[PDB]
Design a binder for this molecule. Structure first.
Ligand SMILES: Nc1ncnc2c1ncn2[C@@H]1O[C@H](COP(=O)(O)OP(=O)(O)OP(=O)(O)O)[C@@H](O)[C@H]1O
Ligand SMILES: [Mg+2]
Length: 244
């Protein structure tokens, strides 16, 4: 993982302590900030490192399909993500989009380690270390009535705050250089020719709403359009949709 900003190195240190626990971990951060890599690192540094690492984007699924995907369904049965994560770690992204029904059932699995079943089948016990992520303000959602406080009192054992790229200014050029160099290997340029000061200013003054994912994509496109090692990269193409 790239970066040397102090906020980021403190995140890695915090992860190294949290990983060995079985407690749930909440990661707060914007899109493209590295949340799922952190979750993965929590898994591989824990004692479950040999178990499954399963991830799910909650905002991708309608209420009934999310319900089925997390908790499974019958009526001979489709196992949900908690079953597939048994002995391992489940990463739930976009937690704040989960409907209240899902949030409440999630509380029950954290509390009582089991998934109940429709039918004459008895409830299913599961053993899963949970990591969840969002950018929302969950305390504020609790005030609004759109996120459950009972859930947050079990889910938020501790909180990993991943800083946005605009607050890791010192890692911007370091990461752009790394991504530029990988893109030079991909298009077979002999050497990355460097960034002009103008390119640097463009990179450093942009607020990066998509953070590191967006940085990578902008840098790759830019290197490709530049297309040579004979002079430094001057034109950073932030927005490829801009017209004529
Ligand atoms: N510290 C880092 N060093 C190297 N690559 C990174 C780093 N952080 C993020 N990335 C890369 O940037 C992209 C975004 O990372 P990732 O998907 O894990 O972020 P996220 O917060 O999970 O975002 P989202 O849910 O929007 O996908 C990926 O291409 C990933 O490899
Ligand atoms: Mg991702």
């Amino acid at each position: 993982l790239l970066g040397e900003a102090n906020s980021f190195l403190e995140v890695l240190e915090q992860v190294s302590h949290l990983a060995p626990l079985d407690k749930p971990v909440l990661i707060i951060g914007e899109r493209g900030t590295g949340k799922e890599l952190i979750a993965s690192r929590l898994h591989y540094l824990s004692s479950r490192w040999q178990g499954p690492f399963i991830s799910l984007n909650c905002a991708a699924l309608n209420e009934n399909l999310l319900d089925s995907e997390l908790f499974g369904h019958e009526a001979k049965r489709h196992p949900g993500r908690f079953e597939r994560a048994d002995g391992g770690t489940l990463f739930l992204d976009e937690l704040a989009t989960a409907p209240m029904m899902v949030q409440e059932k999630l509380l029950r699995v954290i509390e009582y380690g089991e998934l109940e079943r429709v039918g004459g089948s008895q409830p299913l016990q599961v053993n899963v270390r949970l990591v969840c992520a969002t950018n929302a303000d969950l305390p504020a959602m609790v005030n609004e009535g759109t996120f459950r406080a009972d859930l947050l009192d079990r889910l938020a054992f501790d909180v990993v705050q991943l800083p946005p790229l605009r607050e890791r200014e010192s890692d911007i050029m370091l990461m752009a250089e790394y991504f530029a160099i990988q893109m030079c290997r991909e298009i077979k340029l002999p050497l990355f020719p460097g960034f002009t000061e103008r390119a640097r200013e463009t990179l450093l003054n942009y607020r990066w709403p998509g953070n590191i994912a967006e940085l990578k994509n902008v840098v790759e496109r830019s290197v490709y359009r530049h297309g040579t090692s004979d002079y430094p990269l001057d034109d950073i193409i932030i927005d490829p949709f801009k017209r004529r």
